[PDB]
Design a binder for this molecule. Sequence first.
Ligand SMILES: Nc1ncnc2c1ncn2[C@@H]1O[C@H](COP(=O)(O)OP(=O)(O)NP(=O)(O)O)[C@@H](O)[C@H]1O
Ligand code: SF4
Ligand SMILES: [Mg+2]
Lengths: 802, 911
Amino acid sequence: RYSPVELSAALGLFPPTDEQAAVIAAPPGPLVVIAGAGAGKTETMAARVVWLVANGFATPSQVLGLTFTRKAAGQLLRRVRTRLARLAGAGSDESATVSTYHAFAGTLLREHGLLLPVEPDTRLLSETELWQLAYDVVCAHPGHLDTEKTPAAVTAMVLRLSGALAEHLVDTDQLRDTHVELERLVHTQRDRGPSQWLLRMLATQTERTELVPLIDALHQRMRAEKVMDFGMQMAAAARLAARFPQVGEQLRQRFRVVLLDEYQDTGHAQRIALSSLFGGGADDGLALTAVGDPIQSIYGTNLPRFTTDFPYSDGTPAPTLELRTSWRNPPSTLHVANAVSEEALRPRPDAEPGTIRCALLNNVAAERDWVADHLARAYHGAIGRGEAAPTAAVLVRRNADAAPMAEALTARGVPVEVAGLLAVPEVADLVAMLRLIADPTAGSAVMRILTGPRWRFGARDIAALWRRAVELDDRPLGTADIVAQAAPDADTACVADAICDPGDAERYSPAGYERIVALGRELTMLRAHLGHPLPELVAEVRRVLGLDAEARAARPVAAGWAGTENLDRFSDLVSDFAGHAGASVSALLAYLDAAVEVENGLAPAELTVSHDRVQILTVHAAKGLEWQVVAVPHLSARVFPSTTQARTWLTDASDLPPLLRGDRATESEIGVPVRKILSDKISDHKKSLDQRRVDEERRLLYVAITRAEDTLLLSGHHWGATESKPRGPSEFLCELKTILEEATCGEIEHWAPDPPLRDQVVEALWPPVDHVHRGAQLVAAAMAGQEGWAADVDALLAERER
Amino acid sequence: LLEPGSNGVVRLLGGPGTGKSSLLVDTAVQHDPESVLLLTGSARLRTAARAAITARLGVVREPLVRTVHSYAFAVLRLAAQTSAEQDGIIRELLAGDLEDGWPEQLWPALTTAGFATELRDLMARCTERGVDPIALQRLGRTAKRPEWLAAGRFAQAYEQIMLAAELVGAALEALGADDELLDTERNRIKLLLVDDAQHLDPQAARLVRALAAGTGLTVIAGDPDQSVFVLLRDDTHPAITLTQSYRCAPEIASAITGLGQRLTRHWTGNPQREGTVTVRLAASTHAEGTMIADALRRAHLVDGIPWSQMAVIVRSVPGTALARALTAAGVPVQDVPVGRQPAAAALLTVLDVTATGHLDADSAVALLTGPIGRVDPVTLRQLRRALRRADGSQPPRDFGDLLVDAIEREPKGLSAEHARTLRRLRAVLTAARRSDARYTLWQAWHASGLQRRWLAASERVGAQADRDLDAVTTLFDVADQYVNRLRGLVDHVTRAEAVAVLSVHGALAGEWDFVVIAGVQEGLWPNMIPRGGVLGTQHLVDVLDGVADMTDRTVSTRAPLVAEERRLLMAAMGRARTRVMITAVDSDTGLLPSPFCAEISAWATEPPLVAPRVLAPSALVGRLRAVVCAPAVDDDARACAAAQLARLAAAGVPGADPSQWHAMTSLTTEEPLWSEHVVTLSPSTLQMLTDCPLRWLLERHGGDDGRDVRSTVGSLVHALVSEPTESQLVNELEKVWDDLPYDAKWYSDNELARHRAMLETFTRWREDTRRQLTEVATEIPVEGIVVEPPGVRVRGRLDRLERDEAGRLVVVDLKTGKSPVTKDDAQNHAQLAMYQLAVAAGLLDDEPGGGKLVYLGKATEREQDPLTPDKRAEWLETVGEAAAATAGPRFVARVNNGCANCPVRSSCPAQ
DNA sequence: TTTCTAATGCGAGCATGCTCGCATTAGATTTTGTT
Ligand SMILES: Nc1ncnc2c1ncn2[C@@H]1O[C@H](COP(=O)(O)OP(=O)(O)NP(=O)(O)O)[C@@H](O)[C@H]1O
Ligand code: SF4
Ligand SMILES: [Mg+2]
């Protein structure tokens, strides 16, 4: 066997530091390794794996690596594979197995389901094949529902609540006695009887106990169809692992080292699914290392409880090893990434410090301009330097308020700003054409086609078209007359009638009548296709339109030949939804609209580019990416702390009470002593339940700060757009000002004193008015009179001749 | 060896591609016409073998060429001197076994099909490996695994109830029954061309030995290395070895044999057939598909090798993501019940309704959009209107009822073209009634002319006619089956040259010239999928099959064995006779190449490409015209691309010339609406025209999704309030409420209760505010010029007018909403300002008063201060400016608070 | 034509200081996951 340092130097890599020495030299046994942010994870992982496989404690086929997200799992798999392969050179057939948690739970079910009454061949639901079903069971439910809420807005509560029952393992049978304890107490200053506010809270509890039958109906409906969601899946795996020990015995026999990578972002459904299998009281020979960071928990407290949950099986807790030396700038790590101390890191590469700059402006436009100017001068200085390419990026809290940053940077920089699949103008036209084909009474589609680039129309032609469409109606008060109108049958005025029976050619412009005739011929061609299978009809529509060629005809010569990936992914989604319980050329559009409403379109192709682009991505996303200088623009009163969208367990009918939330991380509302006593006791519990929301923003802010690879330009605006009051700088900035001004390491800029704000509006005349024109003239001159294009063209024409 | 009058038994073997399959043909031809038996392995192989032998041979008699299962069936036939029904038996047996009180750990699992399928697999494997149920019970007693002995006793119970995969097991004892029946066939058949012995079952192996005790001659042929699917080709019997490929190239054979080194493993490719092996990669799941399409198209069109000589041998079609992307580039690809198929379903519904004798309305529409009489949506919208002119009704009649009555008797009001679209239905629904005494289905088929149309659609959509005819022929075959076995019928039926993508297992009979082994992914091709379950079938099958593992359940339920997985790829490459291509992907963001990609790269001839070239016109032109319109790169290739686009557009290929280019299309008019004038502005219209004139145009004209249900209930409440006593209104609302489309039955009642409360709030407010305001008129129209030189002449309808207590005129308007507007925006409300303007200019009958703007929901109100000439002039100026804005082209598109629900949002330029 | 929930500043109700309905206005937080 070999020691860590000797084993490392036998390979081609640097000697691991002392921090990366203890964990590698750690003996096989359940241990947790708190790895700091930037401290070099997913490399110590491979170091530990290669240490074990070299000293001979376990062969490669017995290693197992679990990681929360797919990309991180792929990274770990690649690193482990290359390390194991390289070790074969210096003193084979099998390889590691790496899986994201839910994939492991899926495999566990498919291998041991029948020990439970769980089908193995259960389809898994996206977030839009579910909603389109949980909105069916709520529609068909027979009863009263004394709720005073629109359907498709109690479906939201049913989904949210049933997405937490299957996370804290409650199974809806014990969530029926939760309101008697509080109602009896509230029913038994001024002697008015219980206050108006108090009854409101009780109403929510009664409403939740009224939803219970809806929650139970949905589960049986999914059992009948052999269909299961992510939450129900992981909960089933947890129940199986907890109940049956032979599965754990099997899995511990097969796997001798397990790599729980991202263990601070996993909830109570997996904390018990993964201790019961291996770590409960099992053999100490299994390695069981877990590298979490307890401060950066964006998604959503298992780390503080890992010890006494994965013990030595004699009743003794597990070790704990740390990782520091974050490979980060001193100024961010020192005095700044200590923004949240709340623990009751060091400058690693002894590299050159960096500037950190704050600013209080007097306008969102002003702060946007300031950040834009700083990033722009940093980018342009690279050009004079000889292409330094700082490739910065801005971290923004809200998903909105990042589009105008593209406006403020495209003047000088070149951003990417990493729109759903159904907002790309290559696909939206395809969806609109499908809609106009399938159902005529869609004005929001007839306009998208009549004013689209393929043939623009003028106001006069649209008005004449609608004139004919209303003249063709010819329909002549009473209540029965009103209700008879607006049935699924009754007819109205719709533009899609004029396009088919235009009438006299005099009313339309002489150029605009030919377009109407051509569109009519096109639509009458396509409307014969509705009998065809849906995945073929979609491609036929795409071929008839020019989308396939034009989506490429607008693309930099830099990118090779791409452009059609969005179309092809959409046609993939179509080819997946179809052949599935129904062709449904008109129930596809219901799927597409439901997808637009929930999950914000779909997942695009996510094209990657390698320029010196300034990314405009969101702070909540992109964890683990540490690239360059970053800036967080908005730190005002209500944007970053975001503490307004707080709905606690006593008002939102779709949140589990603390007394029942198997986490019990929050306070449980003792309420054992006894109305003014109680009325005060609730507000204290709410305030305590509010500080958790704040504690969930430090972690966002700490994650944002700890991405500062080069320098920071954090800032805070004032007098946000479209409001009346100043909305001064929030928390996270005043304290940030203080922590900056007591050191070497911040600079203060413009610090606008706190004071009628902007009312300027945005406009764009409709019918819009060059390289394309010059190229067209060039092509025309060519008609008048390398990459191998000549041979390709000759081959295509030889095909055409036939 | 292998000659007339030779020994009783001889062994034949050799590497893949050798002449073994066709070698055996010659010795059959030279040899009685009978006494020769050829056992191939599949009926698809039988076609080729019999075709070769017979075409190599007027009085020639077909040699008996069959399969092992078929031969066992024929043996049982002489001894006489399906999975669906199987699963039904097994599931009902388990349901019965659940009655009384298996190791009891899995009692809950018995009701499930998941256990039935695994039990089916266990029994099938046991039968294929030839182990009696009593023997398996003995195994379950010896090895302390209760589930095994339980399954053995279950198999014993199963075989009790009988006395398609047990034919060999039956025949094995069927031969031993007589012990003279053996001699009958041993003296009948002399040759016994049993072939492809690597694919034989251990039970079927025993039958071959039994038939080859000794007589005449027998031949066994097959490579004893690609056994993956366990043969025993080891004896002192005479052996013939073949070592010249005759199919694969020596470059290909090099790679295959190099693979086989780490596993007669030696053989060399045909020297004449020069070829190569190429290993490629891709940077995404789509790059692989498009580059496979690229390579296939180039091979077809530049290298001359056609379709039907190419293939994509992938791991196993779960796969499906490849046929699509491979067809999109224009590459033909080879390869849902009659109930689902629409053409069959339409005629099925015709038959159903004919048998029933009564046609519901909701089933007459469903065959206007079908293929029997086909109507598109904007012709249904002509039928609806035309029929509702036949009998004008104050509330229009339901379209289903109108259609069914029209079908059964034709109203001839409009009937211009719609005479035929109903005549087809007349003919079919009558000729179906004509017989009423099967044959009626054919009569219905003939009555409609769709047969002639479809058979005249042999052009271009022409594929759809072929599919539809396939479906209808299948339906006719089912009808014949039922006639030889009509309300009992409807529920009876309720229950070439092209690249051929196919899985590796089915791709063991390919003579292809160009194999593309897609999907050599790491988690796919070397499978890490656990083989275990609950019954331990995988761990039992190897203990049962020899001593592959002792009585330990340790190595079986881990993953498929690599040595058993590399043979697949080794045999897969062997199919390619000229060129191979192993394609894998590796992308940074979720995918890696297998441990086999690197090894194959050793013997291969030659930054994975991220956006590969394609050869298809809609791609090539979109590349060419993409460089000519470049800001500045490719200065002379720009001219080359211009010339190439000229050549392209000289013939066709839509998208080349700037006429077809989208960004070159020109607006039609660019001319004002009413350049001439007086323009009418209803009070609601002005409230959108002061915000977003583009919204005014594109929504008030044609862009509105159309008449939601919260809009007609509001107007219904308006109408109920209008007429001139709360107790009588509720019973007007109740009777009419039931014909309202709501999604949820429980929602209808809640909305009805809320709106009843809304009417009650209205009456409470009315009787409250009669103390100072008196109603001059209700639902009074407004019409008359107000400002004019362009004039506006507001026209509209007023909700309710009131005369103030001291010489004034207060105008109100009831809204049925929940969310009132602020008290400063309701001071500048465009609608109420317009009403006060109309009042001030007379035309109602006279001074400006307030505007109450009463909200019935929840009764809050937001008043407006009565006008003054100081303000009235400004409002007149605003109205004039709006009227001017209506005219000119290029309407402004301002953004405002309401810009979050306007139906025209997917087309405004401000977004 | 149309809206959830809540935080705000009154403003009478009664043991000057709260105190609690009552009416009026601002915003609609972000993605991670199967074959
Ligand atoms: N001596 C030969 N001369 C010319 N052509 C031959 C000769 N032997 C075989 N072939 C050709 O090779 C083709 C392939 O048939 P054959 O090789 O007999 O199948 P097979 O290789 O045995 N199947 P496999 O198990 O993959 O080896 C035949 O159709 C013949 O046309
Ligand atoms: S979204 Fe705004 S700018 Fe666009 S049409 Fe609607 S109101 Fe006008
Ligand atoms: Mg009204």
